Each structure stands twice: as C-alpha cells, then as structure tokens.
C-alpha cells in the first residue's frame, strides 16, 4: 500500500486546492519510512523523495549519468541538451563558454530594464480590470528577457512557447518532432545571420567561441539555443504563474509583502522551495546502494524535489511559507555541477515581477467565474491564473 507503486510525475493527483500539493504533503510523509520507492509507470523506475537521499544522488557523478536527465527523453531529435544531458569533461568544458554572461554581475545589466517591461506590461490591462496573470504576465516577463539575451525578436512569445510545447512533450505522437524541426529551422536561420552582423547577446558570444582552439559545430550551437530557449521560458513562466495564484488568495501573504519589501528578495526563496516546478532524473551506470536500496545500471531514478523540499528533517514547519526562514537551502534549482545555470536570473525576475506587480495592483483575486488550470510534468505549475482587480490607472502615456 505505497504511493510509489504508481508514482508518476506527468500524472500527479490534484487536490481541491487545485494544486498537486495534497499529494506531495502525503507522499512527503511516506518517505520518512521509505525514502525511495519503485514505480510501475514508464516501464519501471525509481522515485527518490528523501532530502538526504536526493542529495546523495545529484552528488555521486560516478554512478549516475545526466545523459538521462529528461525522462521520458525530451523531443529533440539527434541533438543533446547542452550542459544538461552531458557529463564531464564535455560539461565542465561546454559550460565555461557561457559561465560569464550568466554571472550575477552580467545578469544585472538588465535589472532595471525588467521593471520597465514589467511595469510596461501592467499597462496592457491595468485599465480592463482582469486578465490571465499566467498568459498575460507570468509568460511574457521571462520570454521577452530571453529573446533579448539570445538576440531575438521580442514579440513571438507564442511561436516559441509552441516549440517548447513540443520539446516539453504533449503526449503527442511525433507532431512534437514536426514542430521541433521548426525550432531547428529558425535556430539555423538565426545562427547564420549572426556570424555576419553580430551583437552583444549570448547567442552571438558562443559562435565566435572555440573549444580546443577550433570553433564549434552548429549541432552544438543549435544545441545551446534549445537549452536556453527552454531554460528561461518554461520553468520560469510556470513558477511565476504560481506566485501570482498564490498572492491572489494568500492575502495574509500579499499584505505582508506589500508592507515589507526588504523581505521580497528573501521570501522569493521560500517560494522557490514551496513552488519549485523543477524535477529531474539521472541514469544508473553502475550498481550502487542508496540508503537501503540497490540500483542496477540501465534504470532511471527520478529526483522528486517538491517532495524533498518538504522533508521535516531539514525544514522547520515545511508546510507553511515562512518569509523569514533563514537559511533557505532547498533544491528547487538543484546542487552539484548541475546547479541551475540561470540560478541568479530568476531571483531577479521574481524580485521585480512581484515587487512591481504589487505596487501597481495592490488588490486582485482569483476570478470566481473562471477556474485555474495546473500544468504537470518535469515542469509543473499554474498555466492559467485569471484574477479580478479594481480597474486602475497606467503610467504609460
Ligand atoms: C524558475 C525557473 C528555473 C528553474 C526552477 C530551473 C531549474 C533548474 C534545475 C533543477 C537545474 C539542475 C538540474 C540538475 O542538477 O541536473 C537547472 C539546470 C539548468 N538550467 Fe535552470 N531553471 C530555471 C531557470 C533557468 C533559466 C532562466 C535559465 C536560462 C538561461 C536556466 C538554464 C539552465 C541550464 C542550461 C541548466 C543546465 C546546466 C547545468 O545546470 O549544469 N535555468 N535549472
Ligand atoms: C529539461 C529540464 C527538465 O528543464 C530545466 C528548466 C530544469 C532541469 C532540466 C534542464 C533545464
């Protein structure tokens, strides 16, 4: 009578609250006894839910390969996800090619440029009264910024989200391939129109790049593009979709942030722990024993962060958002050599998005006449969060 029996991450039961949190809180329980379980979904796999246990997997690079990070494998053809489906040396090497454009320093030069666009997207409907905080804001803030890093066309959110919708998987036959081939099409065009008349963007920074003293093949360039056009548009879009659905009803939290922004940065981390959409797996390359279980090479182990972010033997009162909690050592971004590449970037987007969104519309609420839809998968969160506020005034013209 275990929940691991049929544990499935693209299929987690949703409580009345609308979130699959009722499940986690409960499974979070079972793990105290059995920190790891075997699931019968997807041919057969391992579920790692204990904090001490998931933290033991991400660290032993020996027995676990990242060549199976997305699982079931992500729709990407004969292209491997850079610095993510590759183990070192490839990893250590490939990454140092974008290490700098992502450092806190370099990812600050866009700082007060995100407030503009945020505070400039709040003009879009601050005069209507409502709007899907997901589609309308959750999505555009992370999508526009990216476009700007990969030297891209700002208003095509729709097009990109369409590609990522196929990478991300839509349990569709191969139409994920038909559509991924277009990302590869545009990805190709963009590449070729950069090695001529460049820019300061990242996409460009890597072309001129060279490994071993020799440039790089486009099967690695079209490879990065994917990871990035996928790093900051999905996980983020969802995550934000969440804090907005969370601030729509958690008035105890809304009013508290509204009156103490010194905390917004900190409380942005407690939200990452509680609403982290990120979930990954590893691939077993050699017999190894974790805690009390033994895993033979060939099998995959899913690392259930949402569950290990609620382990009581690591977090005081885990089921409450404690905006003061310090330190916050969750794993919603992972640890080890695979520590999120855009780690500092979302702490920023959040800081702002939320900071500015509350100074503009300090009152709003879950639209009663439209129900919120939650996304599932290795990336989950709110997809549609329609709110209703007091029709206001915009700063724009
Ligand atoms: C809120 C959104 C985000 C979340 C929760 C998230 C989560 C994660 C997680 C869990 C990992 C590590 C997995 C592992 O250890 O194997 C990771 C890796 C990575 N993320 Fe993100 N991410 C987010 C946003 C970003 C952004 C903004 C970018 C895009 C520029 C980015 C780029 C990447 C890349 C390329 C890696 C693989 C390289 C590596 O860590 O070794 N992430 N992220
Ligand atoms: C593919 C997947 C699941 O998505 C992101 C956002 C988090 C972990 C990995 C790499 C980047």
Whether 85 lines ligand 1, by a CB cut-off of 6 Å, is no
Distance from residue 378's CA to the centre of ligand 2 (Å): 8
CA-to-CA dists, residue 211 to 67, 91, 97, 206, 218, angstroms: 21, 12, 9, 10, 13
| Tokens, residue 55 | 């933290």
| Tokens, residue 360 | 């503009």
Contact 127, 396 (CB under 8 A): no
| Ligand number, closest to the Cα atom of 243 | 1
Contact 137, 150 (CB under 8 A): no
* Full DSSP string of 357-396: HHHH-S---B-TTS--EEE-SSB-EEEE-EEE------S-
Residues 236 and 204: their CA atoms lie apart, in Å, by 23
Distance from residue 27's CA to the centre of ligand 1 (Å): 25
* Full DSSP string of 184-195: HHHHHHHHHTTS
CA-to-CA dists, residue 376 to 218, 219, 235, 303, 347, angstroms: 32, 30, 11, 15, 23
Please choose, from the candidates 351, 388, 387, the residue with its C-alpha nearest in 3D space to the C-alpha of residue 245: 387
Phi, psi of 299 (to 5 degrees): -90, 165
Phi, psi of 300 (to 5 degrees): -115, 145
Locate tokens 């009722």: which residue? 22
Distance from residue 45's CA to the centre of ligand 1 (Å): 23
Contact 176, 270 (CB under 8 A): no
Q: In 243-253, which positions are buried (b, 16+ CB within 10 angstroms) versus exposed (e)?
A: bbbbbbeeeeb
Cis peptide upstream of residue 83 (ω within 30 degrees of 0): no
Atom of ligand 1 nearest to the CA of 350: 1
Please choose, from the candidates 256, 279, 261, the residue with its C-alpha nearest in 3D space to the C-alpha of residue 350: 261
Atom of ligand 2 nearest to the CA of 232: 6
Ligand 2 first shell, C-beta below 6 A: 69-70, 84, 231, 234-235, 278, 280, 378-379
Contact 167, 74 (CB under 8 A): yes
Distance from residue 232's CA to the centre of ligand 2 (Å): 9
By alpha-carbon position, which residue is closest to atom 16 of ligand 1? 338
Atom of ligand 2 nearest to the CA of 230: 6
Phi, psi of 113 (to 5 degrees): -105, -20
Q: Which domains does the chain have, with CATH numbers?
A: 1-397 (1.10.630.10)
> Residue length, the chain?
397
Residues 248 and 241: their CA atoms lie apart, in Å, by 11
Locate tokens 């949402």: which residue? 306
Q: What is the best residue among 59, 272, 340 to mutate for testing ligand 1's pocket, by most ligand atoms within 8 Å of CB? A: 340
State the angle between helix axes of 343-360 and 251-258 in degrees (0 to 180), rounded to the nearest 10.
Answer: 90
Distance from residue 192's CA to the centre of ligand 2 (Å): 27
Q: Which resolution in angstroms does this entry have?
A: 3.0
Atom of ligand 1 nearest to the CA of 331: 10
Residue 73 neighbours by CB distance under 10 Å:
12
Method by which the model was determined = X-ray
By alpha-carbon position, which residue is closest to atom 5 of ligand 2? 231
Residues 147 and 138: their CA atoms lie apart, in Å, by 15
Q: What is the best residue among 84, 229, 340, 381 to mutate for testing ligand 2's pocket, by most ligand atoms within 8 Å of CB? A: 84
20: which DSSP letter? T
């Amino acid at each position: 009578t275990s929940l691991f029996t049929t544990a499935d991450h693209y299929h987690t039961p949703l409580g009345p609250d609308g979130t699959p949190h009722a499940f986690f809180e409960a499974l979070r329980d079972e793990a105290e006894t059995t920190p790891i379980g075997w699931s019968e979904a997807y041919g057969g796999h391992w579920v790692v839910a204990g904090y001490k246990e998931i933290q033991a997997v991400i660290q032993n690079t020996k027995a676990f390969s990242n060549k199976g990070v997305t699982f079931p494998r992500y729709e990407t053809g004969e292209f491997e996800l850079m610095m993510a489906g590759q183990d070192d040396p490839v990893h250590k090497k490939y990454r140092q090619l974008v290490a700098k454009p992502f450092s806190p320093e370099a990812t600050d030069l866009f700082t007060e440029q995100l407030r503009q666009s945020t505070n400039d997207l709040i003009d879009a409907r601050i005069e209507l009264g409502e709007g899907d905080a997901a589609t309308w804001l959750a999505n555009e803030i992370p999508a526009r910024l990216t476009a700007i890093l990969l030297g891209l066309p700002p208003e095509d959110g729709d097009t990109y989200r369409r590609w990522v919708w196929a990478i991300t998987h839509v349990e569709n036959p191969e139409e994920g391939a038909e559509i991924f081939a277009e990302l590869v099409a545009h990805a190709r065009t963009l590449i070729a129109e950069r090695r001529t008349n460049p820019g300061n963007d990242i996409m460009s920074r890597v072309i001129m790049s060279k490994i071993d003293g020799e440039s790089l093949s486009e099967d690695d360039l079209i490879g990065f593009f994917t990871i990035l056009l996928l790093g900051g548009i999905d996980a983020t879009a969802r995550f934000l979709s969440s804090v907005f659905w969370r601030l729509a009803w958690d008035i105890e939290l809304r009013r508290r942030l509204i009156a103490h922004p010194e905390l917004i940065p900190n409380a942005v981390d407690e939200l990452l722990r509680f609403y982290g959409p990120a979930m990954v797996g590893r691939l077993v390359t050699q017999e190894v024993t974790v805690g009390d279980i033994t895993m033979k090479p060939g099998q995959t182990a899913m690392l259930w962060f949402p569950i290990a972010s609620r382990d009581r033997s690591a977090f005081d009162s885990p089921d409450n958002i404690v905006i003061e909690r310090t330190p916050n050592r969750h794993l919603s971004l992972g640890h080890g050599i695979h520590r999120c590449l855009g780690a500092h970037l979302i702490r920023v987007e959040a800081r702002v998005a939320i900071t500015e969104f509350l100074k503009r519309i300090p009152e709003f609420s879950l639209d009663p006449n439209k129900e919120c839809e939650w996304l599932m998968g290795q990336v989950a969160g709110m997809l549609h969060v329609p709110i209703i506020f007091p029709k206001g005034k915009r700063l724009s013209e």
